[PDB]
Copies of this chain bind each other. A is one copy, B any other.
Amino acid sequence: MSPSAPVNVTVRHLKANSAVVSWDVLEDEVVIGFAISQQKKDVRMLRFIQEVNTTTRSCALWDLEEDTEYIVHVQAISIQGQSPASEPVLFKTPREAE
């Protein structure tokens, strides 16, 4: 069996080249990690981050493109399995300062 997809996935502290992703899970007692997928709306480069044996509920994304739209999906990892993708979170980075 497996955990439920992550809920309330939000994007905070969104900067020109970085952002932080947060979420919640329904079963905190079963979730040991997470897997995140990142790709630009204009897909090309695909970035994947996974962390296990942690209690974290946020993951930073660095070296993002300025004035660019991204699509991130979060998944929850259990000791027995993994959950389906959360709902896609979409966002766009601010412009580079001049």
Contact = CB atoms under 8 A, between A and B. Distances in A.
The copy count of this chain in the complex is 2
Contact of A52 (B45, B49, B50, B63): B45
Contact of A51 (B46, B52, B54, B60): B46
B49 A48 contact: yes
B45 A51 contact: yes
A33 B32 CA distance: 27
A48 B51 contact: yes
Interface of A: 44-54, 56, 60, 62-63
22 contacts: A44-B53, A44-B54, A45-B51, A45-B52, A45-B53, A45-B54, A45-B56, A46-B51, A46-B52, A46-B53, A47-B49, A47-B50, A47-B51, A48-B49, A48-B50, A48-B51, A48-B52, A49-B49, A49-B50, A60-B62, A60-B63, A62-B62
